[PDB]
Amino acid sequence: SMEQVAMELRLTELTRLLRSVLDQLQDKDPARIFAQPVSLKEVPDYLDHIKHPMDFATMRKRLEAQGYKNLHEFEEDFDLIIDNCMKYNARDTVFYRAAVRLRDQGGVVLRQARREVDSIG
Ligand code: NA
Numbered sequence: 001s002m003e004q005v006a007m008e009l010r011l012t013e014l015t016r017l018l019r020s021v022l023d024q025l026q027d028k029d030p031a032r033i034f035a036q037p038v039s040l041k042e043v044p045d046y047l048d049h050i051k052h053p054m055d056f057a058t059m060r061k062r063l064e065a066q067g068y069k070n071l072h073e074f075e076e077d078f079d080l081i082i083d084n085c086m087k088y089n090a091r092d093t094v095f096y097r098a099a100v101r102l103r104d105q106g107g108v109v110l111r112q113a114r115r116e117v118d119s120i121g
Contacts, residue, residue: 014117015066018074021113022063025078026056028105033098034081049088054080071117075110082106 029035037055038046046053059077068074082103089095 010121011066011069013120014068014070015063017113017116018063018068018071021074021109022056022059024109025102025106028102028109029056029098031098033095034085034102046088050084052080053084054078056081071110071114078106078110 026035035056037053037058038050040046054077059074059081062068062077063074082099085099086096089099
C-alpha cells in the first residue's frame, strides 16, 4: 500500500537523521571508550553489575536495520551508555568522568535533534 510506503519513507528519514546524531555523539568520544561492548573476557563480572549493556556499535547495528521507531528510543540507548558507565565506575575514575563529559556534550546535539523531529514530523 501507499500508506505503508509513506510510513516507510518517514522511518527511513528518521534513520538518516539518527545516523548523523550518532556520528555527532560519537565525535564527542575521541578516546573511543564507548565504541564497543564491554568484554566479558576482560570484565567477567560485568553482567552481575549491568543488566542492559549498551555501546555505539550496538546502536549503529540497530540503526542500520532501521530499528529505531522514534528519537525517544535512540535517546534511551544513549542514556544506557552513560548511566551504565556511571554505575560500574567510581566518581574519581577517568571512565566515570568520560561519561559525564559525553552526557553534557551529547545533551546539546539531542536538544536540537528533538526540535528537528517535531518540526519535520
Ligand atoms: Na558506582
